[PDB]
Amino acid sequence: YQYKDILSVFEDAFVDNFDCKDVQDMPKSILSKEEIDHIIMSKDAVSGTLRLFWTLLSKQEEMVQKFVEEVLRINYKFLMSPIKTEQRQPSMMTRMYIEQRDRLYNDNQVFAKYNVSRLQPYLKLRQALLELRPAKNVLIDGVLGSGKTWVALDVCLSYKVQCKMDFKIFWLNLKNCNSPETVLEMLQKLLYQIDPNWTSRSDHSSNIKLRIHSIQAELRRLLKSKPYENCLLVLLNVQNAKAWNAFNLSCKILLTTRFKQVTDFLSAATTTHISLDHHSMTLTPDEVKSLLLKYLDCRPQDLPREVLTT
Amino acid sequence: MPKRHREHIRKNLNILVEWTNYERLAMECVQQGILTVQMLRNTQDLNGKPFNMDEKDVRVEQHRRLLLKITQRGPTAYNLLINALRNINCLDAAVLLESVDE
């Protein structure tokens, strides 16, 4: 199989026990010089191990085998066993997690490769996830095209997110959803991705709105089922709070609000709200240079850029 | 080892750090094969910020550091601790260590 996929599972072990501070036996080829530095200044293990994973996945698939097979065997004694027992045997839930995760790469193919991990928000968002009650929802707002889609996928990818969420995560993009027809097919596709089964007899052209009430009730009934207790229904670029006014059926939903009206409509108590047009929310110069390196792809010529735009 | 051992080592940090000497425990553990040069250097060292505060708790904190490191080592290492402490002959901490188990 692979090593990089199995890496993302047991972050908890490394944050719990592993420490990069005592692990500084770097082979030159296994790391990009500075990260046996930048990990340390980036706190101890909550972010240091996350960025450790990010950097480790940045390279190809061999130096990770190097890490587990010779770098780890010198100091960590718990830590030989899990990877050897994980690489080959591959448990049932890891398999479904990686299936869903390969799917999440499958439907993107752009952010799936051109992503750059913006730590600090991701650090300040999955906490609302690990808290999110079966009725509450999470709001994120920021500038247009703030990577709100990018960061949403970034956080979604956290193995903790799939694991608690019971690996059932579903996306909807609120594009042109400002008509009481523009949501009908939205509800239809939501049903179908929930289940490609429908009792199409109830269709009544008399009231497109009575029909939307009926489908909301039906999909709510499907919601209150043993597997679908925690099914993740994220809404992308909410055009208006009116669209959400249909999308309220006591779920662990969460929304990336794009407009001030939408984000300010919600109650901060009943709905946690996270900003992006905020000094700490934004990208570091390190983040910016990582992105321009993701795109330009020239380390020696990276310096040839100025310092502007965010 | 189980998390019960983790909670025991963290909750009994004070008695373990007070019954046991710093340098003797360090030399014992390193000669037990428990630590290498890099990790012993890290464990003995601190932020360097605590240089401002009183040295009286510095080494003790370093000694405290030792516990925080050895809980990381494998399940039998605690038994090695059980062995290592008997090399220390500091059995007052050893009985408390063994009290939670069995």
Short mmCIF file of C-alpha atoms in Angstrom, two decimals:
data_model
loop_
_atom_site.label_atom_id
_atom_site.label_comp_id
_atom_site.label_asym_id
_atom_site.label_seq_id
_atom_site.Cartn_x
_atom_site.Cartn_y
_atom_site.Cartn_z
CA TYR A 1 0.00 0.00 0.00
CA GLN A 2 1.28 3.43 1.01
CA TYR A 3 2.92 5.10 4.00
CA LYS A 4 1.74 8.68 3.49
CA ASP A 5 -1.94 7.76 3.73
CA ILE A 6 -1.45 5.89 7.02
CA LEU A 7 0.48 8.85 8.43
CA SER A 8 -2.60 11.03 8.88
CA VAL A 9 -4.33 8.58 11.23
CA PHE A 10 -2.44 8.73 14.54
CA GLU A 11 -1.55 12.38 14.91
CA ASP A 12 -2.74 11.90 18.49
CA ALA A 13 0.19 9.60 19.25
CA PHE A 14 2.76 12.13 18.08
CA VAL A 15 1.16 15.10 19.81
CA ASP A 16 0.92 12.92 22.93
CA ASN A 17 4.38 11.37 22.93
CA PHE A 18 6.55 12.39 19.97
CA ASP A 19 8.60 15.57 20.28
CA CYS A 20 10.65 17.03 17.44
CA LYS A 21 12.86 18.83 19.97
CA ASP A 22 14.60 15.58 20.94
CA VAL A 23 14.41 14.29 17.35
CA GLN A 24 17.06 16.25 15.45
CA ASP A 25 18.96 13.44 13.70
CA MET A 26 17.91 14.80 10.27
CA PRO A 27 19.09 13.05 7.14
CA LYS A 28 19.61 15.90 4.69
CA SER A 29 17.37 14.30 2.06
CA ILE A 30 14.46 13.55 4.41
CA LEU A 31 13.70 17.22 5.15
CA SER A 32 14.10 20.69 3.64
CA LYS A 33 16.77 21.93 6.06
CA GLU A 34 14.75 24.71 7.70
CA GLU A 35 11.88 22.58 9.01
CA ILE A 36 14.04 20.93 11.66
CA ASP A 37 13.97 24.58 12.73
CA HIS A 38 10.59 26.07 11.84
CA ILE A 39 8.72 23.22 13.53
CA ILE A 40 10.34 24.15 16.85
CA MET A 41 9.49 27.86 16.79
CA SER A 42 5.98 26.85 15.71
CA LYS A 43 5.11 25.66 19.22
CA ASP A 44 5.83 22.21 20.65
CA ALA A 45 3.55 19.57 19.12
CA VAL A 46 0.03 20.89 18.45
CA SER A 47 1.19 22.77 15.35
CA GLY A 48 4.74 21.43 15.10
CA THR A 49 3.54 17.88 14.49
CA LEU A 50 0.81 19.03 12.09
CA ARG A 51 3.33 20.92 9.97
CA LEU A 52 5.64 17.95 10.41
CA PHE A 53 2.98 15.86 8.72
CA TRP A 54 2.43 18.50 6.05
CA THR A 55 6.13 18.67 5.21
CA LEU A 56 6.46 14.89 5.36
CA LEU A 57 3.64 14.52 2.84
CA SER A 58 5.16 17.30 0.73
CA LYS A 59 7.99 15.04 -0.44
CA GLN A 60 7.54 11.75 -2.28
CA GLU A 61 6.86 8.37 -0.72
CA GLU A 62 10.36 7.13 0.14
CA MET A 63 11.82 9.39 2.83
CA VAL A 64 8.73 8.61 4.91
CA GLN A 65 9.78 4.96 4.83
CA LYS A 66 13.22 6.25 5.74
CA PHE A 67 11.75 8.10 8.71
CA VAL A 68 9.79 5.15 10.05
CA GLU A 69 12.39 2.49 9.28
CA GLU A 70 15.65 4.03 10.42
CA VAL A 71 15.07 7.53 11.81
CA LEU A 72 12.44 6.31 14.28
CA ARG A 73 14.14 3.08 15.42
CA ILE A 74 16.90 4.98 17.21
CA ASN A 75 14.80 6.69 19.88
CA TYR A 76 11.07 5.85 19.80
CA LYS A 77 10.26 2.36 21.05
CA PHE A 78 6.46 2.44 21.05
CA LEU A 79 6.63 3.82 17.56
CA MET A 80 8.06 1.02 15.43
CA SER A 81 5.02 -1.17 15.93
CA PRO A 82 2.07 1.00 14.76
CA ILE A 83 3.40 1.69 11.26
CA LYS A 84 4.43 -1.91 10.62
CA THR A 85 1.02 -3.04 11.90
CA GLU A 86 -0.73 -0.35 9.84
CA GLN A 87 1.12 -0.45 6.52
CA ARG A 88 0.19 -4.04 5.66
CA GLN A 89 -2.91 -5.00 7.62
CA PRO A 90 -4.88 -1.74 6.97
CA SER A 91 -7.92 -1.81 9.27
CA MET A 92 -11.56 -1.50 8.06
CA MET A 93 -12.11 2.12 9.18
CA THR A 94 -8.77 3.35 7.86
CA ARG A 95 -9.78 1.85 4.53
CA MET A 96 -13.08 3.73 4.42
CA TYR A 97 -11.37 6.93 5.56
CA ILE A 98 -8.81 6.72 2.76
CA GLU A 99 -11.58 5.84 0.30
CA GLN A 100 -13.52 8.99 1.19
CA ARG A 101 -10.30 11.02 1.19
CA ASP A 102 -9.28 9.78 -2.25
CA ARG A 103 -12.79 10.76 -3.31
CA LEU A 104 -12.25 14.24 -1.89
CA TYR A 105 -9.11 14.57 -3.97
CA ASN A 106 -11.00 13.03 -6.89
CA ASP A 107 -13.64 15.75 -7.18
CA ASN A 108 -11.17 18.66 -6.92
CA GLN A 109 -8.01 17.92 -8.96
CA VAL A 110 -6.87 21.54 -8.49
CA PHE A 111 -6.92 22.34 -4.79
CA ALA A 112 -6.24 18.61 -4.51
CA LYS A 113 -2.69 19.47 -5.59
CA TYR A 114 -2.34 23.27 -5.51
CA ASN A 115 -3.34 23.54 -1.85
CA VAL A 116 -1.16 25.37 0.66
CA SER A 117 -1.95 24.67 4.31
CA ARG A 118 -2.92 27.82 6.22
CA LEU A 119 -2.26 26.58 9.74
CA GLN A 120 -3.56 29.18 12.19
CA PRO A 121 -7.22 29.20 11.03
CA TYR A 122 -7.23 25.42 10.57
CA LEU A 123 -5.82 25.40 14.10
CA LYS A 124 -8.75 27.59 15.20
CA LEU A 125 -11.56 25.81 13.32
CA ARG A 126 -11.43 22.03 13.84
CA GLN A 127 -11.98 22.75 17.53
CA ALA A 128 -15.51 23.88 16.74
CA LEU A 129 -15.77 20.60 14.83
CA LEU A 130 -14.67 18.47 17.77
CA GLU A 131 -17.28 20.37 19.78
CA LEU A 132 -20.06 20.66 17.18
CA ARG A 133 -23.32 19.39 18.60
CA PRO A 134 -25.83 17.50 16.41
CA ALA A 135 -27.79 20.75 16.07
CA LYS A 136 -25.22 23.55 15.96
CA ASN A 137 -23.30 24.84 12.95
CA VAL A 138 -20.07 26.68 12.21
CA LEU A 139 -19.81 29.94 10.26
CA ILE A 140 -16.67 31.14 8.50
CA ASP A 141 -16.60 34.49 6.71
CA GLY A 142 -13.94 36.45 4.88
CA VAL A 143 -12.97 38.19 1.68
CA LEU A 144 -14.23 36.82 -1.62
CA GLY A 145 -12.19 33.86 -2.79
CA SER A 146 -10.32 33.82 0.51
CA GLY A 147 -9.60 30.19 0.04
CA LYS A 148 -12.79 29.68 2.01
CA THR A 149 -13.37 26.64 -0.16
CA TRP A 150 -9.65 25.92 0.15
CA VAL A 151 -9.58 26.16 3.94
CA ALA A 152 -12.88 24.30 4.27
CA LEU A 153 -11.41 21.35 2.40
CA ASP A 154 -8.15 21.75 4.33
CA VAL A 155 -9.88 21.37 7.68
CA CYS A 156 -12.28 18.69 6.41
CA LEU A 157 -9.26 16.57 5.50
CA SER A 158 -8.14 16.30 9.16
CA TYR A 159 -8.43 12.62 10.07
CA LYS A 160 -9.96 13.73 13.36
CA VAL A 161 -12.74 15.38 11.34
CA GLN A 162 -13.67 12.23 9.44
CA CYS A 163 -13.20 10.04 12.50
CA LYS A 164 -15.55 11.92 14.81
CA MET A 165 -17.86 12.85 11.96
CA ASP A 166 -18.12 9.13 11.23
CA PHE A 167 -16.52 9.75 7.84
CA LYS A 168 -19.80 10.91 6.26
CA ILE A 169 -19.16 14.40 4.88
CA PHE A 170 -21.21 16.06 2.14
CA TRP A 171 -20.73 19.32 0.25
CA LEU A 172 -23.20 21.75 -1.30
CA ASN A 173 -22.28 24.89 -3.20
CA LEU A 174 -24.85 27.66 -2.85
CA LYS A 175 -24.66 29.03 -6.38
CA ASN A 176 -27.70 30.97 -7.59
CA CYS A 177 -29.93 29.71 -4.78
CA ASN A 178 -32.08 32.84 -4.56
CA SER A 179 -35.32 31.45 -5.97
CA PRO A 180 -37.78 28.93 -4.51
CA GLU A 181 -36.95 26.63 -7.40
CA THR A 182 -33.18 26.96 -7.31
CA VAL A 183 -33.20 24.90 -4.11
CA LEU A 184 -35.59 22.15 -5.23
CA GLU A 185 -32.95 20.38 -7.31
CA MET A 186 -30.52 21.10 -4.48
CA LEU A 187 -32.76 19.08 -2.15
CA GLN A 188 -33.12 16.43 -4.84
CA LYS A 189 -29.39 15.90 -5.23
CA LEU A 190 -28.99 15.97 -1.45
CA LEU A 191 -31.51 13.14 -1.23
CA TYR A 192 -29.76 11.22 -3.97
CA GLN A 193 -26.31 11.50 -2.42
CA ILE A 194 -27.99 10.48 0.82
CA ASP A 195 -29.85 7.83 -1.16
CA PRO A 196 -30.76 7.44 -4.85
CA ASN A 197 -34.28 6.47 -3.77
CA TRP A 198 -37.32 8.72 -3.85
CA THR A 199 -41.10 8.49 -3.67
CA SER A 200 -41.71 10.78 -6.65
CA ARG A 201 -45.51 10.58 -6.29
CA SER A 202 -45.77 13.51 -3.86
CA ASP A 203 -44.70 15.98 -6.57
CA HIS A 204 -47.38 18.67 -6.66
CA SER A 205 -46.96 21.65 -8.97
CA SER A 206 -49.61 23.49 -6.93
CA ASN A 207 -47.04 24.61 -4.35
CA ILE A 208 -43.32 24.41 -5.02
CA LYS A 209 -43.01 25.62 -1.42
CA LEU A 210 -45.29 22.97 0.07
CA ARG A 211 -43.13 20.49 -1.83
CA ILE A 212 -39.98 21.93 -0.31
CA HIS A 213 -41.58 21.55 3.12
CA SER A 214 -42.37 17.92 2.31
CA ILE A 215 -38.85 17.17 1.13
CA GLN A 216 -37.38 18.93 4.17
CA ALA A 217 -39.52 16.76 6.42
CA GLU A 218 -38.58 13.59 4.53
CA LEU A 219 -34.86 14.32 4.52
CA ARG A 220 -35.07 15.25 8.20
CA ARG A 221 -36.66 11.86 8.84
CA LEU A 222 -33.78 10.24 6.97
CA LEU A 223 -31.42 12.39 9.04
CA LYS A 224 -32.68 10.97 12.34
CA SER A 225 -31.37 7.49 11.50
CA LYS A 226 -28.70 5.52 13.33
CA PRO A 227 -25.90 5.95 10.72
CA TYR A 228 -26.82 9.52 9.71
CA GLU A 229 -26.72 10.78 13.29
CA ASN A 230 -23.62 12.80 12.33
CA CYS A 231 -23.66 13.46 8.58
CA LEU A 232 -21.71 16.53 7.50
CA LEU A 233 -23.61 18.89 5.18
CA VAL A 234 -21.47 21.95 4.48
CA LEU A 235 -22.92 24.80 2.41
CA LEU A 236 -20.53 26.62 0.10
CA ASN A 237 -20.82 30.36 -0.61
CA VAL A 238 -24.19 30.95 0.99
CA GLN A 239 -25.92 33.43 -1.30
CA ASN A 240 -28.37 34.52 1.40
CA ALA A 241 -29.73 33.60 4.80
CA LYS A 242 -32.98 32.78 2.98
CA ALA A 243 -31.32 29.74 1.40
CA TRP A 244 -30.29 28.56 4.85
CA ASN A 245 -33.81 29.24 6.07
CA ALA A 246 -34.67 26.07 4.19
CA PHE A 247 -31.38 24.46 5.25
CA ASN A 248 -32.21 24.09 8.93
CA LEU A 249 -33.12 20.55 10.00
CA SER A 250 -31.11 19.99 13.20
CA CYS A 251 -27.85 18.76 11.68
CA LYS A 252 -24.14 19.15 12.25
CA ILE A 253 -24.15 21.50 9.25
CA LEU A 254 -21.68 24.34 8.84
CA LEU A 255 -21.58 27.28 6.47
CA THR A 256 -18.92 29.38 4.76
CA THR A 257 -20.71 32.72 4.71
CA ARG A 258 -19.64 34.92 1.81
CA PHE A 259 -21.73 38.04 2.48
CA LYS A 260 -22.02 40.27 5.52
CA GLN A 261 -25.81 39.93 5.59
CA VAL A 262 -25.54 36.14 5.77
CA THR A 263 -22.95 35.97 8.54
CA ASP A 264 -24.55 38.74 10.59
CA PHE A 265 -27.98 37.12 10.32
CA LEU A 266 -26.91 34.21 12.49
CA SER A 267 -26.73 34.24 16.28
CA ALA A 268 -23.17 34.05 17.60
CA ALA A 269 -24.36 31.89 20.49
CA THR A 270 -26.44 29.32 18.61
CA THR A 271 -23.92 29.55 15.74
CA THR A 272 -20.20 29.95 16.30
CA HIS A 273 -18.69 32.52 13.93
CA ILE A 274 -15.05 32.63 12.79
CA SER A 275 -13.55 35.50 10.81
CA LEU A 276 -11.01 35.68 8.03
CA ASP A 277 -10.71 39.46 7.53
CA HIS A 278 -8.60 39.45 10.66
CA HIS A 279 -4.93 40.02 11.36
CA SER A 280 -4.22 36.55 12.73
CA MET A 281 -6.65 34.84 10.35
CA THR A 282 -4.68 36.02 7.32
CA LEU A 283 -1.60 34.42 5.76
CA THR A 284 1.94 34.79 7.03
CA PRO A 285 4.72 35.84 4.66
CA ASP A 286 5.81 32.24 5.11
CA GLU A 287 2.38 31.15 3.89
CA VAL A 288 2.63 33.51 0.93
CA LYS A 289 6.08 32.30 -0.07
CA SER A 290 4.92 28.70 0.27
CA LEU A 291 2.06 29.45 -2.13
CA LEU A 292 4.27 31.22 -4.66
CA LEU A 293 6.56 28.21 -4.43
CA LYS A 294 3.58 25.90 -5.00
CA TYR A 295 2.85 27.84 -8.19
CA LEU A 296 6.10 29.27 -9.57
CA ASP A 297 8.00 26.17 -8.38
CA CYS A 298 11.46 27.75 -8.13
CA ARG A 299 13.28 27.82 -4.79
CA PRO A 300 16.39 29.75 -5.93
CA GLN A 301 14.23 32.24 -7.85
CA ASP A 302 11.65 32.53 -5.06
CA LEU A 303 13.61 35.49 -3.66
CA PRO A 304 13.05 37.33 -6.97
CA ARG A 305 9.53 38.28 -5.83
CA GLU A 306 8.53 41.43 -3.96
CA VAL A 307 6.37 41.57 -0.80
CA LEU A 308 2.80 42.52 -1.76
CA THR A 309 -0.74 41.10 -2.12
CA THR A 310 -2.38 38.62 0.26
CA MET B 1 1.72 1.11 28.65
CA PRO B 2 -1.89 2.00 29.47
CA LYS B 3 -2.97 5.59 30.10
CA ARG B 4 -3.43 4.76 33.79
CA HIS B 5 0.36 4.73 33.99
CA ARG B 6 0.40 8.15 32.31
CA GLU B 7 -2.00 9.61 34.85
CA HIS B 8 -0.01 8.00 37.66
CA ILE B 9 3.30 9.45 36.47
CA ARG B 10 1.85 12.92 35.92
CA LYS B 11 -0.12 12.95 39.19
CA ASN B 12 2.85 11.62 41.19
CA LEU B 13 5.37 13.98 39.62
CA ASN B 14 5.92 15.75 42.94
CA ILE B 15 6.69 12.72 45.12
CA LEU B 16 8.87 11.16 42.43
CA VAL B 17 10.83 14.38 41.87
CA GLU B 18 11.27 14.89 45.63
CA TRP B 19 12.32 11.39 46.72
CA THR B 20 14.80 10.97 43.87
CA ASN B 21 18.09 12.77 43.28
CA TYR B 22 18.65 14.48 39.95
CA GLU B 23 22.17 13.55 38.84
CA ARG B 24 22.06 10.03 40.29
CA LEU B 25 18.80 9.30 38.51
CA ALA B 26 20.17 10.79 35.29
CA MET B 27 23.33 8.68 35.36
CA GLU B 28 21.34 5.58 36.30
CA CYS B 29 18.80 6.01 33.50
CA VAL B 30 21.41 6.82 30.86
CA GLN B 31 23.48 3.81 31.93
CA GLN B 32 20.26 1.77 31.79
CA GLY B 33 20.14 2.49 28.06
CA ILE B 34 17.05 4.64 28.59
CA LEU B 35 18.46 7.82 27.00
CA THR B 36 20.82 8.89 24.24
CA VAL B 37 22.98 12.01 24.18
CA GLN B 38 20.53 14.17 22.22
CA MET B 39 17.51 13.34 24.37
CA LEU B 40 19.42 13.62 27.66
CA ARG B 41 20.71 17.01 26.55
CA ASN B 42 17.17 18.07 25.69
CA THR B 43 15.72 16.77 28.96
CA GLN B 44 18.39 18.39 31.12
CA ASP B 45 18.05 21.64 29.18
CA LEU B 46 15.03 23.94 29.42
CA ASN B 47 13.62 26.98 27.65
CA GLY B 48 16.52 29.08 28.92
CA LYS B 49 13.90 31.58 30.01
CA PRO B 50 13.87 29.91 33.49
CA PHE B 51 17.44 31.15 33.87
CA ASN B 52 15.94 34.37 35.26
CA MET B 53 13.99 32.57 37.97
CA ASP B 54 15.59 30.88 40.96
CA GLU B 55 17.94 27.97 40.31
CA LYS B 56 16.38 26.15 43.29
CA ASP B 57 13.50 24.86 41.15
CA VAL B 58 15.45 24.75 37.89
CA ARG B 59 17.13 21.36 38.32
CA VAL B 60 14.00 20.07 40.05
CA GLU B 61 12.02 21.17 37.00
CA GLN B 62 14.68 19.47 34.90
CA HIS B 63 14.19 16.44 37.14
CA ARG B 64 10.46 16.89 36.56
CA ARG B 65 11.34 17.00 32.86
CA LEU B 66 12.84 13.53 33.24
CA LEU B 67 9.47 12.06 34.20
CA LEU B 68 7.79 13.82 31.28
CA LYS B 69 10.30 12.10 29.01
CA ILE B 70 10.28 8.61 30.49
CA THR B 71 6.51 8.33 30.28
CA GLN B 72 7.21 8.48 26.54
CA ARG B 73 9.37 5.35 26.62
CA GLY B 74 8.00 1.87 26.02
CA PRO B 75 5.77 -0.16 28.34
CA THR B 76 8.63 -2.15 29.85
CA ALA B 77 10.69 1.00 30.44
CA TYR B 78 8.55 1.69 33.51
CA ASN B 79 9.66 -1.72 34.74
CA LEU B 80 13.17 -0.54 33.88
CA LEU B 81 12.32 2.43 36.07
CA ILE B 82 11.29 -0.12 38.68
CA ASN B 83 14.74 -1.61 38.14
CA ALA B 84 16.50 1.75 37.86
CA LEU B 85 14.97 3.08 41.08
CA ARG B 86 16.20 -0.01 42.93
CA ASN B 87 19.65 0.88 41.64
CA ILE B 88 18.97 4.25 43.24
CA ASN B 89 17.72 2.29 46.28
CA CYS B 90 15.08 5.04 46.52
CA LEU B 91 12.40 2.51 47.37
CA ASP B 92 10.06 5.02 49.04
CA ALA B 93 9.12 6.18 45.54
CA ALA B 94 9.25 2.60 44.25
CA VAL B 95 6.47 1.37 46.53
CA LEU B 96 4.26 4.28 45.44
CA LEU B 97 5.08 3.53 41.80
CA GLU B 98 4.08 -0.11 42.22
CA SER B 99 1.06 0.75 44.38
CA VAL B 100 -1.21 1.81 41.51
CA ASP B 101 -0.63 -1.38 39.54
CA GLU B 102 -1.70 -4.95 40.41
#
